[PDB]
Structure formats: structure tokens, C-alpha cells
mmCIF file of C-alpha atoms (C1' of nucleotides) in Angstrom:
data_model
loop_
_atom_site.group_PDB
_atom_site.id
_atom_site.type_symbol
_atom_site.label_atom_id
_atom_site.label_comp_id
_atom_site.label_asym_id
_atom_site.label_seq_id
_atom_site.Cartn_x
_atom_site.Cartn_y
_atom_site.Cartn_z
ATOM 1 C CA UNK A 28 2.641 -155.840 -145.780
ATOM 2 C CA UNK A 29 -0.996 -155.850 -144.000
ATOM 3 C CA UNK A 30 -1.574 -152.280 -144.674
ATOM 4 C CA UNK A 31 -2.963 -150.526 -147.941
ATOM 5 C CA UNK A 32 -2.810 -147.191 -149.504
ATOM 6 C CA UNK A 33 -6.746 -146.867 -151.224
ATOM 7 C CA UNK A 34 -7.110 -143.444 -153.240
ATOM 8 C CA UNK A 35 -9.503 -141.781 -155.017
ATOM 9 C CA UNK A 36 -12.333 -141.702 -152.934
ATOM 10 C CA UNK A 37 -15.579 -140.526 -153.713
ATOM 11 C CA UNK A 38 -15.808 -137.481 -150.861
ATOM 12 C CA UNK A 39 -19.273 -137.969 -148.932
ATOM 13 C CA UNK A 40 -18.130 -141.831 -146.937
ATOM 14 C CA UNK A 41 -16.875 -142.318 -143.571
ATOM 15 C CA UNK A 42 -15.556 -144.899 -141.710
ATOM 16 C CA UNK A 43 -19.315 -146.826 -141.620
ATOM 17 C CA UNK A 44 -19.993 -146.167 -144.844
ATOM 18 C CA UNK A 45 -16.468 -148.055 -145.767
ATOM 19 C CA UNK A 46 -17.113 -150.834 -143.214
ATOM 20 C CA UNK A 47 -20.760 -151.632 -144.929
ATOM 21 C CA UNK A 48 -19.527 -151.287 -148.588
ATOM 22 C CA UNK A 49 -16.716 -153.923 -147.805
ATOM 23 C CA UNK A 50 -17.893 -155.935 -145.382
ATOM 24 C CA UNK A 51 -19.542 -157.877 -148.295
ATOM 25 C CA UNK A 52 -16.017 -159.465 -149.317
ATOM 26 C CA UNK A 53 -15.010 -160.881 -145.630
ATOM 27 C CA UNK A 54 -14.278 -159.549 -142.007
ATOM 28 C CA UNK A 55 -12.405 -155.934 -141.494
ATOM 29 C CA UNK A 56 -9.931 -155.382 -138.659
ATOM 30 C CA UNK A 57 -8.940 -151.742 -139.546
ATOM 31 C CA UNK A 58 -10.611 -148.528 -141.430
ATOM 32 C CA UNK A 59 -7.989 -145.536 -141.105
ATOM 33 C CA UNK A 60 -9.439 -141.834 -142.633
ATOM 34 C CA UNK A 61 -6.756 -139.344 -142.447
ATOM 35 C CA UNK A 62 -8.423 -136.069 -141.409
ATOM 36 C CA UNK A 63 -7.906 -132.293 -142.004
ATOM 37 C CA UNK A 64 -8.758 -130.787 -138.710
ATOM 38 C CA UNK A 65 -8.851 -127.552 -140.008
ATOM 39 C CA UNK A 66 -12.071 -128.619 -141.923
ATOM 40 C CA UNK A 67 -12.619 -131.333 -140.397
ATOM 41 C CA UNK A 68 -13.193 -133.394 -143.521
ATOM 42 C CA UNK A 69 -11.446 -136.258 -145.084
ATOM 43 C CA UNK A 70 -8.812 -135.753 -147.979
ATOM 44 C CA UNK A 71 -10.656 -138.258 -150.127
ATOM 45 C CA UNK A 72 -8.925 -141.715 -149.590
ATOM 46 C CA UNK A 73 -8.469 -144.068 -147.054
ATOM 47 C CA UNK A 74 -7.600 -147.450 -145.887
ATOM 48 C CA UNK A 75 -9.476 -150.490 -145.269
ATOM 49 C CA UNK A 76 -7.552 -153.557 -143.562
ATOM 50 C CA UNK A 77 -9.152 -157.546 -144.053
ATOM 51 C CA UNK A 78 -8.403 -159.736 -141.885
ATOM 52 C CA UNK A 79 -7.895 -162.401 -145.169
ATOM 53 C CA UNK A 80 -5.301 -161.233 -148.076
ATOM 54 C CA UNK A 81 -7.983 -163.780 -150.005
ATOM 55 C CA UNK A 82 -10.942 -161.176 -148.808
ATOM 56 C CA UNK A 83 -8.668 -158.531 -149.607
ATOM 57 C CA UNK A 84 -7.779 -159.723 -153.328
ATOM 58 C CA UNK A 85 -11.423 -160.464 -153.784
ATOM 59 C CA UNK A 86 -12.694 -156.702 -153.146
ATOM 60 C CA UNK A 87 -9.758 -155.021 -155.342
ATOM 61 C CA UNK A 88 -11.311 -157.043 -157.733
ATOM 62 C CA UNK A 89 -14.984 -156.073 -157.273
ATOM 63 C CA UNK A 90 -14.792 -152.502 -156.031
ATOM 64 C CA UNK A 91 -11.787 -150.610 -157.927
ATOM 65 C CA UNK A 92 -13.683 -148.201 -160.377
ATOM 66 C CA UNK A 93 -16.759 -149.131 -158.797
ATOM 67 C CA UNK A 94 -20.219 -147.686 -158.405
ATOM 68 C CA UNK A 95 -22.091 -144.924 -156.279
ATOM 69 C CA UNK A 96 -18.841 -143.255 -155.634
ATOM 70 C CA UNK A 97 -18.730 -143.841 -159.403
ATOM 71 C CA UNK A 98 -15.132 -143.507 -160.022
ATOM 72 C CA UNK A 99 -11.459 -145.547 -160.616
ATOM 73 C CA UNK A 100 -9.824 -146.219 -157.580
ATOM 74 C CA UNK A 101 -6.265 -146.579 -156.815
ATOM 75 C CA UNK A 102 -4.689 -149.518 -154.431
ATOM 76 C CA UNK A 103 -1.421 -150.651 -153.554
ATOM 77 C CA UNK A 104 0.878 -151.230 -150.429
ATOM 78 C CA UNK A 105 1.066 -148.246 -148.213
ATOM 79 C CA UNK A 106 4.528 -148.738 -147.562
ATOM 80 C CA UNK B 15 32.009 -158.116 -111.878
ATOM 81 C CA UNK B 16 29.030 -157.692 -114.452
ATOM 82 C CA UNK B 17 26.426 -158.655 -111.522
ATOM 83 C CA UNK B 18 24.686 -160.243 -115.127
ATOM 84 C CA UNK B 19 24.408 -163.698 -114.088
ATOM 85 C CA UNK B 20 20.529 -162.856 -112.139
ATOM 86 C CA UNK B 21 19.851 -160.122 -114.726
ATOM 87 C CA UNK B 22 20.444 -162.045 -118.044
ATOM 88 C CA UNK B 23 17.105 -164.798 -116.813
ATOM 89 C CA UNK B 24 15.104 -161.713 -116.018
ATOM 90 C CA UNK B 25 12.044 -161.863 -117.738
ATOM 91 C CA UNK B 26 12.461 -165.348 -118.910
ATOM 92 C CA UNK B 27 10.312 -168.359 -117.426
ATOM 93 C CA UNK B 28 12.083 -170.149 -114.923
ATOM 94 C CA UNK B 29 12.125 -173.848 -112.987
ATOM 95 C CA UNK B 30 13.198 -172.416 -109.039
ATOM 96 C CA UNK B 31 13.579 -175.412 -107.074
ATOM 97 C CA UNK B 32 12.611 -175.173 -102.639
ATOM 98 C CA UNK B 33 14.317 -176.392 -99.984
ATOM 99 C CA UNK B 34 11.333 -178.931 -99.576
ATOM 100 C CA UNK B 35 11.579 -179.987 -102.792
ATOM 101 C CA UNK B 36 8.898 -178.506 -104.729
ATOM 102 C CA UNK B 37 9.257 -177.063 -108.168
ATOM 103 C CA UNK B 38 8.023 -173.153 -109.060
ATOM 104 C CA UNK B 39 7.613 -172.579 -112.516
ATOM 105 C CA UNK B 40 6.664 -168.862 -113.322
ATOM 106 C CA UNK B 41 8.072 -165.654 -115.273
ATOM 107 C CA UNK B 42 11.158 -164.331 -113.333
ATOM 108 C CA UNK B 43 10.756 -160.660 -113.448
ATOM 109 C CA UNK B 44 12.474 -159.431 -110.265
ATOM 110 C CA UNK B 45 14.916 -160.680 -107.336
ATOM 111 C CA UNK B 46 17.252 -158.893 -104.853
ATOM 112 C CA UNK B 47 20.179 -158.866 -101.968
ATOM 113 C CA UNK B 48 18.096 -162.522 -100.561
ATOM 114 C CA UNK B 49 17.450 -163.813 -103.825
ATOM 115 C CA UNK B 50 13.705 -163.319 -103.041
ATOM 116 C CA UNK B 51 12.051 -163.634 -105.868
ATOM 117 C CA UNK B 52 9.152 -162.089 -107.994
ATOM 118 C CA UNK B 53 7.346 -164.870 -109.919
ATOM 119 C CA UNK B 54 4.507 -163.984 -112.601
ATOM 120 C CA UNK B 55 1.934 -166.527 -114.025
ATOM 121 C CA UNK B 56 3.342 -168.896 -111.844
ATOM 122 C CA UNK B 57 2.494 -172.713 -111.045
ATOM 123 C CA UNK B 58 3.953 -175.009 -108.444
ATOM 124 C CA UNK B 59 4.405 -178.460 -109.195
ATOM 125 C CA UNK B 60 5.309 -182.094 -106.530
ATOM 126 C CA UNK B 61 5.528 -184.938 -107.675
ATOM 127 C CA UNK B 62 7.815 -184.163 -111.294
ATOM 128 C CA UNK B 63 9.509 -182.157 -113.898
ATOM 129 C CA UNK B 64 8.415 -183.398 -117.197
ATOM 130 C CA UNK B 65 10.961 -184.641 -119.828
ATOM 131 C CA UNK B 66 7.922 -186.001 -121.874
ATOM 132 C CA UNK B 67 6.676 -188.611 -119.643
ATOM 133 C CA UNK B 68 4.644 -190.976 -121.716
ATOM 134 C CA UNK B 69 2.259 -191.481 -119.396
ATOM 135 C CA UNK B 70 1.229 -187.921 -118.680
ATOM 136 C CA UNK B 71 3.259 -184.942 -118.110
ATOM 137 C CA UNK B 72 1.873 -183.084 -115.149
ATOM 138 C CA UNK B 73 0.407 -184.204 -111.825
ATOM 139 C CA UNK B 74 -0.238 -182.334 -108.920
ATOM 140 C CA UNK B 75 -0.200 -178.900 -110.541
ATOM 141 C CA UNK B 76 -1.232 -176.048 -108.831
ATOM 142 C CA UNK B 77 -2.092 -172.326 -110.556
ATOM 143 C CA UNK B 78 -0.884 -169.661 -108.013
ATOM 144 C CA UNK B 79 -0.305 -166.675 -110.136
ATOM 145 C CA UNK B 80 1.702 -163.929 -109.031
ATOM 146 C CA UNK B 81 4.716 -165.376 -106.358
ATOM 147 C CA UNK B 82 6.622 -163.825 -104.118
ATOM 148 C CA UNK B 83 9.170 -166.573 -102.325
ATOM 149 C CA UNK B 84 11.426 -165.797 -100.142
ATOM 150 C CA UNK B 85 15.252 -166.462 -100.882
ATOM 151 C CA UNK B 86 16.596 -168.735 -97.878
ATOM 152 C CA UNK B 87 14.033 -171.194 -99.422
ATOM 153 C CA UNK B 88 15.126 -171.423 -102.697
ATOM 154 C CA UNK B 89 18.150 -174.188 -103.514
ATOM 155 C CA UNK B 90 18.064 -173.609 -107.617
ATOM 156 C CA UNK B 91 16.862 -171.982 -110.787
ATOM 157 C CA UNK B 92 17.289 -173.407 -114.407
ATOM 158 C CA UNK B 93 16.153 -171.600 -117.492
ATOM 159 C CA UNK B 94 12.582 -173.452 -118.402
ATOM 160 C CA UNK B 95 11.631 -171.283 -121.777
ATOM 161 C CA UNK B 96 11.721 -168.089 -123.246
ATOM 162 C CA UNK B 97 9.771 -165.079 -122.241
ATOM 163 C CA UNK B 98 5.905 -164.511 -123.021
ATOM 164 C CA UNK B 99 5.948 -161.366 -125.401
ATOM 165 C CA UNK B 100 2.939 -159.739 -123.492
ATOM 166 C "C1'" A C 15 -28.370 -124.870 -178.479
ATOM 167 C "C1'" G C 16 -24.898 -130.841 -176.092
ATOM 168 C "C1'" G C 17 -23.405 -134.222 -168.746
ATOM 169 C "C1'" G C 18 -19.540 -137.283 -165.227
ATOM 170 C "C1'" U C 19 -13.706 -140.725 -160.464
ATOM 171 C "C1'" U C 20 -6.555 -143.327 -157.105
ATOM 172 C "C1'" U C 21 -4.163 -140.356 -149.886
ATOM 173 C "C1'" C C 22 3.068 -144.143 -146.713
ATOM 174 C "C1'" C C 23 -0.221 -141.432 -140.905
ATOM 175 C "C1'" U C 24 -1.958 -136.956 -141.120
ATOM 176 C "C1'" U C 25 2.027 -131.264 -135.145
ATOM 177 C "C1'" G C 26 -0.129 -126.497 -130.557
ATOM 178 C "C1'" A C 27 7.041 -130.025 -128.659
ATOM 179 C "C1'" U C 28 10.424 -128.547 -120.025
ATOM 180 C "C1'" G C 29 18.447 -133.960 -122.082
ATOM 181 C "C1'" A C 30 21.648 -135.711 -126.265
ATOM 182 C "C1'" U C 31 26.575 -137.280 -129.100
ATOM 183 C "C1'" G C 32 30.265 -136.168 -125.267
ATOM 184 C "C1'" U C 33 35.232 -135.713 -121.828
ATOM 185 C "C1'" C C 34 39.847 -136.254 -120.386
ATOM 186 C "C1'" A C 35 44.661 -136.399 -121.061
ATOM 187 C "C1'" U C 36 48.804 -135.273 -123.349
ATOM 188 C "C1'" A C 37 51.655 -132.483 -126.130
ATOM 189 C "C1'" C C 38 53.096 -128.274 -128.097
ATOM 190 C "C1'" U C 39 53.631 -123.187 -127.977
ATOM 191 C "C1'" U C 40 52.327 -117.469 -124.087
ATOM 192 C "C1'" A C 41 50.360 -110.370 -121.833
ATOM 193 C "C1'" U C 42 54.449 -115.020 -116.795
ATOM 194 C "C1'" C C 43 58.840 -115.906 -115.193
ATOM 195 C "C1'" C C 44 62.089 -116.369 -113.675
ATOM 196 C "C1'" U C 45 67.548 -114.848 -115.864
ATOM 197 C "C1'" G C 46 72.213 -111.244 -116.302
ATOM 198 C "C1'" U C 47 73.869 -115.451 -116.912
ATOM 199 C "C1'" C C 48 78.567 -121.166 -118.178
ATOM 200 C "C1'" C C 49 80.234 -125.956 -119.838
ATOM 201 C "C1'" C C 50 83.988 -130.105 -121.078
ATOM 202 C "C1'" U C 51 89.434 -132.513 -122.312
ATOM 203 C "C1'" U C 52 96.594 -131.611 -123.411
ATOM 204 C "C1'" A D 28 49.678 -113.175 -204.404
ATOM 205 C "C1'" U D 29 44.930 -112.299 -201.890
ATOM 206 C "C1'" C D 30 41.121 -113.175 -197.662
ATOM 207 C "C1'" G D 31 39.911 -116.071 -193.186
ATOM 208 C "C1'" C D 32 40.966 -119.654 -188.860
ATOM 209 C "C1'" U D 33 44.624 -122.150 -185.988
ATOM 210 C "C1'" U D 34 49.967 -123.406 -183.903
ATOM 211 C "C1'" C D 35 55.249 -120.456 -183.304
ATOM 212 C "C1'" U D 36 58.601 -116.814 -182.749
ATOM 213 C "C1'" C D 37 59.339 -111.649 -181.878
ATOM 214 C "C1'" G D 38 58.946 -106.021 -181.570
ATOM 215 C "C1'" G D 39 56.335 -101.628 -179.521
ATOM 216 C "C1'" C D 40 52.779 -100.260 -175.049
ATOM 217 C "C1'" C D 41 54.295 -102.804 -170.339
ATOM 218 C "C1'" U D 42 56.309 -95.260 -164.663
ATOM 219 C "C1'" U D 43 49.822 -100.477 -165.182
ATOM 220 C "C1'" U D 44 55.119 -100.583 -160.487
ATOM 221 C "C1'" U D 45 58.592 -99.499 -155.652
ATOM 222 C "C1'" G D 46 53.077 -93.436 -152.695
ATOM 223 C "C1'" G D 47 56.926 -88.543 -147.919
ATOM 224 C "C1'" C D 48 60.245 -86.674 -143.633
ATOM 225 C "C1'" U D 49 63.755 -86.817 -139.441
ATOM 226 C "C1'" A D 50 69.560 -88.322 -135.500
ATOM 227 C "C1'" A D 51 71.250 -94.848 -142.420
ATOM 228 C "C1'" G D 52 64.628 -91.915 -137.248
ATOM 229 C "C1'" A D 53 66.824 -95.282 -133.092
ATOM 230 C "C1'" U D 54 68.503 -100.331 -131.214
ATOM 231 C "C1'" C D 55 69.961 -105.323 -132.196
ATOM 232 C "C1'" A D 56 70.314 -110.245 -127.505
ATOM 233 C "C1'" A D 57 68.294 -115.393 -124.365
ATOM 234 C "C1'" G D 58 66.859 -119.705 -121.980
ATOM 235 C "C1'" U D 59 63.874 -122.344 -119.188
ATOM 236 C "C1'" G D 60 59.563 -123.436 -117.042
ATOM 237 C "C1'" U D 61 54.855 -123.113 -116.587
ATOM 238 C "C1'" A D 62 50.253 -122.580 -118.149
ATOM 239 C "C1'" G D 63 46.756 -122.774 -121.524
ATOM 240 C "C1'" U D 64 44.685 -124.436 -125.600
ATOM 241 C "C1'" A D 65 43.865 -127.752 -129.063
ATOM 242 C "C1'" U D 66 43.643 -132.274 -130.837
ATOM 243 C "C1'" C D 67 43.139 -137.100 -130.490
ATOM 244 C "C1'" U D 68 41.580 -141.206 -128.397
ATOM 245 C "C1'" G D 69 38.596 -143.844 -125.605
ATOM 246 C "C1'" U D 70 34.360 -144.829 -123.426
ATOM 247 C "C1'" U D 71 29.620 -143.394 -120.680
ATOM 248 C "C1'" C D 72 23.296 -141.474 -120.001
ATOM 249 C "C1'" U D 73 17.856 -141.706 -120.518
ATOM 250 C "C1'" U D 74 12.666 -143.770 -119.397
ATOM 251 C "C1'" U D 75 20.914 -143.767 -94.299
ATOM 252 C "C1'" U D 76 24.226 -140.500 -92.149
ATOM 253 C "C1'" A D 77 27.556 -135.611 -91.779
ATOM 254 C "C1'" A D 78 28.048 -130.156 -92.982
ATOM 255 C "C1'" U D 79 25.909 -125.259 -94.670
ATOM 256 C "C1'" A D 80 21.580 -121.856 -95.713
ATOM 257 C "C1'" U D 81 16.190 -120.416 -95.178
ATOM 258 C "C1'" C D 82 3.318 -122.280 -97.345
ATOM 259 C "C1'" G D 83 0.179 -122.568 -92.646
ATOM 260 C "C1'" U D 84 -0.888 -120.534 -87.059
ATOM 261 C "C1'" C D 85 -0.123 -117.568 -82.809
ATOM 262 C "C1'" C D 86 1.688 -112.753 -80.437
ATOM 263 C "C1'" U D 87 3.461 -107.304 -80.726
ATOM 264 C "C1'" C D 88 4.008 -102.675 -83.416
ATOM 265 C "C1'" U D 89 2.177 -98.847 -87.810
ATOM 266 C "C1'" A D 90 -1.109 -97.206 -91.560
ATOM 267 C "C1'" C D 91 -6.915 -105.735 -95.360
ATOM 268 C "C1'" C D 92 -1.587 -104.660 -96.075
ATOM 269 C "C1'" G D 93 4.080 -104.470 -94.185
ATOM 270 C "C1'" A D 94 7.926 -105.631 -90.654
ATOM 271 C "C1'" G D 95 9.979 -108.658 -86.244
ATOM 272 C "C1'" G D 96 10.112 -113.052 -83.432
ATOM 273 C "C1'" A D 97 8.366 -119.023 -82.214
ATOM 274 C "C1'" C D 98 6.637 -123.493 -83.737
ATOM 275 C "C1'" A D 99 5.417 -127.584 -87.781
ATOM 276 C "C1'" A D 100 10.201 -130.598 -91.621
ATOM 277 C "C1'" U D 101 12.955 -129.498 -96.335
ATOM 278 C "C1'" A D 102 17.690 -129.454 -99.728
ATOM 279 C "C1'" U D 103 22.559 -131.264 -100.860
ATOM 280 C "C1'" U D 104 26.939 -135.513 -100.401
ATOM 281 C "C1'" A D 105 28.821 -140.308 -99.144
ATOM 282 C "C1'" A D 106 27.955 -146.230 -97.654
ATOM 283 C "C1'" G D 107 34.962 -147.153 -98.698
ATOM 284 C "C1'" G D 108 32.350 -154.171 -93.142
ATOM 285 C "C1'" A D 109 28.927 -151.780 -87.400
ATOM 286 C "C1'" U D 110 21.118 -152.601 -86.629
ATOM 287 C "C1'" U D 111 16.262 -150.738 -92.938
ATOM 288 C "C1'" U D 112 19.043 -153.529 -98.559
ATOM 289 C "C1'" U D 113 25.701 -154.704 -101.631
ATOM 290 C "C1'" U D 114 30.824 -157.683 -97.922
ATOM 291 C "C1'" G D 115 26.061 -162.691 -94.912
ATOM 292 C "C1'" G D 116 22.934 -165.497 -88.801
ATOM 293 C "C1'" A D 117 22.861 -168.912 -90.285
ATOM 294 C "C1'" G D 118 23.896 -174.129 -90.763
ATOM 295 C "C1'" C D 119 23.289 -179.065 -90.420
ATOM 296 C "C1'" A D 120 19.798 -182.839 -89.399
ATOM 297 C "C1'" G D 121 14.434 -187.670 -91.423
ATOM 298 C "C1'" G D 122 14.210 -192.585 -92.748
ATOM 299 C "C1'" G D 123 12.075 -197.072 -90.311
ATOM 300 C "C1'" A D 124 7.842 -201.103 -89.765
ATOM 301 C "C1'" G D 125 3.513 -203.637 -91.638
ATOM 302 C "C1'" G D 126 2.321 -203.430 -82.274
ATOM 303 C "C1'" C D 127 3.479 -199.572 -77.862
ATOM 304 C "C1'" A D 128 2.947 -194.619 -75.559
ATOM 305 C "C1'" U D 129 0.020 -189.332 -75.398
ATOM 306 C "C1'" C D 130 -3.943 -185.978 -76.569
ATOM 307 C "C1'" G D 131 -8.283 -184.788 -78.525
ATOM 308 C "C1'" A D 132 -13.233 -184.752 -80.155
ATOM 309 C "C1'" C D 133 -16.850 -189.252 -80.376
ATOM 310 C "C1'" C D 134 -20.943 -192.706 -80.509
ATOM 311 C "C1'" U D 135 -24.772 -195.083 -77.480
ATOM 312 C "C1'" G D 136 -28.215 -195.128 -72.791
ATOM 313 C "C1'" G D 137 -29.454 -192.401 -68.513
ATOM 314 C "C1'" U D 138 -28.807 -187.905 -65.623
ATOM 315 C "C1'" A D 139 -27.953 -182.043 -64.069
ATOM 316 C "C1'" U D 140 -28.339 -177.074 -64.969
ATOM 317 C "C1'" U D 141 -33.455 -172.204 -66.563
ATOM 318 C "C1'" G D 142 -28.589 -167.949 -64.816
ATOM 319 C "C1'" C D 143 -27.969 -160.895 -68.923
ATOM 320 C "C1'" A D 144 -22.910 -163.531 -72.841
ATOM 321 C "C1'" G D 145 -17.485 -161.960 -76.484
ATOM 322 C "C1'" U D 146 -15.032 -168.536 -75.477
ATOM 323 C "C1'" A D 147 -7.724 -173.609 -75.045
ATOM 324 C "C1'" C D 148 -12.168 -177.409 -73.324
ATOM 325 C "C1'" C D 149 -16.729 -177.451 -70.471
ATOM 326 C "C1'" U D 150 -22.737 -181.602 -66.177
ATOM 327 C "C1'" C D 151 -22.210 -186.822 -64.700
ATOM 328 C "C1'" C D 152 -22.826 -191.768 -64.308
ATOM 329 C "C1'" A D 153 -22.206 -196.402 -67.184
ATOM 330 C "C1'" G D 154 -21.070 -198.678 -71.684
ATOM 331 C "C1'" G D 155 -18.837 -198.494 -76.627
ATOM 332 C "C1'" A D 156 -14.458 -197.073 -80.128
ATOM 333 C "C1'" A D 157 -13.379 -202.628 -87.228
ATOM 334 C "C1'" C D 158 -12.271 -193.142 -84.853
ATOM 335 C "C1'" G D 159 -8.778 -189.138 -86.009
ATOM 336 C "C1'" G D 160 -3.807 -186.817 -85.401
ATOM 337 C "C1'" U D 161 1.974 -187.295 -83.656
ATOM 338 C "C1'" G D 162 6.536 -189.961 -82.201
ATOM 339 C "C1'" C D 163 9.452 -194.547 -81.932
#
RNA sequence: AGGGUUUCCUUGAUGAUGUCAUACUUAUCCUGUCCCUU
RNA sequence: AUCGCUUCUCGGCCUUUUGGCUAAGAUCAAGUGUAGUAUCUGUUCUUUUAAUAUCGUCCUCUACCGAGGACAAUAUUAAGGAUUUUUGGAGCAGGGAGGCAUCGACCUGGUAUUGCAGUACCUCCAGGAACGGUGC
């Protein structure tokens, strides 16, 4: 129950990117970026671990529809 | 029969008792035809086996790591805790 | 003559289900063949 | 009465149906035992020795290549107890007391040795041990 499904990404952030906009809320253990190797791009979502559920309630809070990527993002459990 | 009765304590951490009288405490992970015996993270102990003596616990402990004894020394084993996950 | 946000992971691939025993019907196996009481 | 739908009975089509011939074409019979196939029931893998067979180098022949011989271990199987594993060579034996024996450095004085080595120890003479180890 540790790991999240984050969609609706904004397309031009990596995994830095990610660690710098949500290191703000509390310590990070995990950034996963599924990749098309054929482009070698990102799909456009990923998923960002905390080490605290409290860190991790705290950001959904804060960054869902947020700015610069501009846009209405979707989290839940990934499975 | 089953040849079990070595096999069920592999892996677990073990109390092996010598012929001198010294206690080995390590992780039992291998033994043989001898009984010698494969001993990880393993400590030897003198002058007891703690059942929660008040004063203290442990005295004359000794880290040795990983063991190796050799089976005509060793009288007894008893089942000392579970294995380390790792 | 006018403008805007939600992916469970996500390959270039030299072990898996068996086997054995018993019972019921031939392109083999052998027949030219018999019992039982007053 | 007429028109329509639905039960129910019945008639006519139903060759839409038996698609040849010959000596009714001919003849008229069985049991047992094994082997093979199929089905059902029960339970197993992966992550030393014995037997058989046959890349490198050297030599010879013929036009770097090919053939022939020799040499260097390799592969498979089993462990029903005989040296490297699973049918055992192990076993049993330690407290006693609160001075005695033995060995070894050792500490003081003095004294000898001046030579090219791989080491139980290393001059000797006198004194000193409230020293250390082991056994009873």
C-alpha cells in the first residue's frame, strides 16, 4: 500500500525535476518513470514514493492540479 | 527415515554446546556425515546462558563471526531463535 | 476578427504437470476339438 | 351469416421412398490365451569404481590443404559395510589444599669474547629471587 499510481503529467519532467518539486513536502525513497524505449520519452505520469504517508497526504494536497505543469492530476493506489 | 531432524534447524540460530563446555551461539546454515558444523554471525560464550539474569546477561562474550567446528567436539544443539531474514 | 492539464511496471525468452498398473478387448494363436450322474 | 387470429379433428399431395445382374451370386461355425491400449489412481522434479566407443604436437606420403599412425585425459552407471563423505576409531577419565618436587628466563655486582651470520638455550664468578609456568 506504499506505492502510488500519479497521472497526468505535464510532459517536459524527469526523475530530478520530480525529486525537487516534492522534496518540499518531506523525504522521497522512490521516483519510478515508465519509459517508451522506442522514443525514449516518458508516457506522461509517474510515481513518487515518501518515506511518510503524513508527507505523502500533505503533497496530494498541495500539488494535484498544480502549477507550471499547469494541469489536474490524478492519484491513487497503484495496486 | 526423513533425515529432517538436522535439516528442519537449518538456517535458524542455534545454542551448540562443546565438549569443554563452552556455548556457540551462531546461525546454523550447514552440517554433514561428522556433524561439523557451519556457524554464521557467530559468538562464543563461558561463563552462562542467560535466562534473564538480573544482574547482567552476558559475560565473557566473544564475536567470532563465521565458525566452522568440528563435530567430535560438539555434545548438543538447542533451538536459540528464529532465523535473521537477511 | 477571440488562448490553455490524471500511467498497476513498462519484452529481443536453451524443463514442466506427469507415470505405472490393471483390466478389457486383436492383422496372433493356438484348436479340429468334450464334460458330468441311474 | 361475413372477415381475421388461435386450439381440434380429418381428407387430398405424401413413387418426396426401397437406385441393377448372376449359380435365393456363394457359405454359415469356436474357444482360449496373449498382447496392446486405454483409463484410473497415486505420487515425484527444478534452481569413487566397472564396461563400451573416439582440440594441441611430432613423423611419413600427395597436390597451405587431405589421409595414416603415437602421445596428452574425456563420457556413461552403481556405493547394496572394505581406505576421500551415508552403516562409525573411538571411548572413558580431573577434582584437591590454602607446603614439596622440576624447568625456565631474571635481577644485582664484577669478568670474557672483536670472529663474515639464518638460531631449543648460549661467557663466568659471586650474591639475590615478598618471579613466572606444571603436577601432587
Amino acid at each position: 500500500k506504499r506505492v502510488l499510481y500519479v497521472g497526468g503529467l505535464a510532459e517536459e519532467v524527469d526523475d530530478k525535476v520530480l525529486h525537487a518539486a516534492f522534496i518540499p513536502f518531506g523525504d522521497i525513497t522512490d521516483i519510478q518513470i515508465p519509459l517508451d524505449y522506442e522514443t525514449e520519452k516518458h508516457r506522461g505520469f509517474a510515481f513518487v514514493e515518501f518515506e511518510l504517508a503524513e508527507d505523502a497526504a500533505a503533497a496530494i494536497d498541495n500539488m494535484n492540479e498544480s502549477e507550471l505543469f499547469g494541469r489536474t492530476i490524478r492519484v491513487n493506489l497503484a495496486k | 527415515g526423513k533425515s529432517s531432524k538436522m535439516l528442519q534447524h537449518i538456517d535458524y540460530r542455534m545454542r551448540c554446546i562443546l565438549q569443554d563446555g563452552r556455548i556457540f551461539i551462531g546461525t546454523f546454515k550447514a552440517f554433514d556425515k561428522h556433524m561439523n558444523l557451519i556457524l554464521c554471525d557467530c559468538d562464543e560464550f563461558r561463563k552462562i546462558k542467560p535466562k534473564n539474569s538480573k544482574q547482567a546477561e552476558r559475560e565473557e562474550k566473544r564475536v567470532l563471526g563465521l565458525v566452522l567446528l568440528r563435530g567430535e567436539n560438539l555434545v548438543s544443539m538447542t533451538v536459540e531463535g528464529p532465523p535473521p531474514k537477511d
